[PDB]
């Protein structure tokens, strides 16, 4: 945010400093995995 | 010249000998075989 201030006439302007910052989103990797052994293919009625 | 024996070649065969062993499946036809079964346990019904 900025802000307005007052000054004496003919005096140098004094800015009200506007802050800056950088919001950094760090990218991450996630894995969801499973195994389906072939020995269960003929022993299951479902498709694992 | 007899010096041709210095560049004699040797032949390596592609048909390999297997050390004497059973080929398996000897008892197929001696028992009651059922192909294409499913599941972890197979039930054989019996009538009196």
Is B38 at the interface with chain A, CB within 8 A?
Answer: yes
Resolution (A): 2.1
All residues at 6 or more sequence positions from A7 whose CB lies less than 8 Å from its CB, including other chains: A13, A14
For residue A46, give the DSSP letter.
S
Residues of A in contact with B38 (CB under 8 A): 42-43
Residues of B in contact with A43 (CB under 8 A): 38-40
Method: cryo-EM
CA distance B42 to B34: 10
Is B40 at the interface with chain A, CB within 8 A?
Answer: yes
CA distance B48 to B42: 20
SS3 A38: helix
The nearest CA of chain A is from the CA of B33 a distance in Å of 17
CA distance A18 to A4: 11
- Residue entry with tokens 């003929």: A42
Angle at B19 between CA B16 and CA B21, to 5 degrees: 125
All residues at 6 or more sequence positions from B42 whose CB lies less than 8 Å from its CB, including other chains: B34
In 3D space, the residue among A24, A25, A3, A23 whose CA is nearest the CA of residue A15 turns out to be A3
Task: For residue B17, give both structure tokens.
Answer: 């000998």
- Residue entry with tokens 């140098």: A12
């Amino acid at each position: 945010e900025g802000m307005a201030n007052q000054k004496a006439p003919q005096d140098d302007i004094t800015p009200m400093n506007v802050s800056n910052r950088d919001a950094e989103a760090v990218i991450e990797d996630w894995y969801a995995s499973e195994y389906a052994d072939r020995s269960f293919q003929n022993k299951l009625a479902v498709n694992a | 010249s007899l010096a041709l024996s210095q560049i004699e070649i040797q032949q390596f065969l592609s048909e390999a000998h297997a050390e004497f062993q059973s080929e398996g499946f000897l008892l197929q036809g001696a028992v009651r075989t059922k192909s294409g079964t499913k599941g972890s346990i197979v039930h054989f019904p019996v009538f009196g």
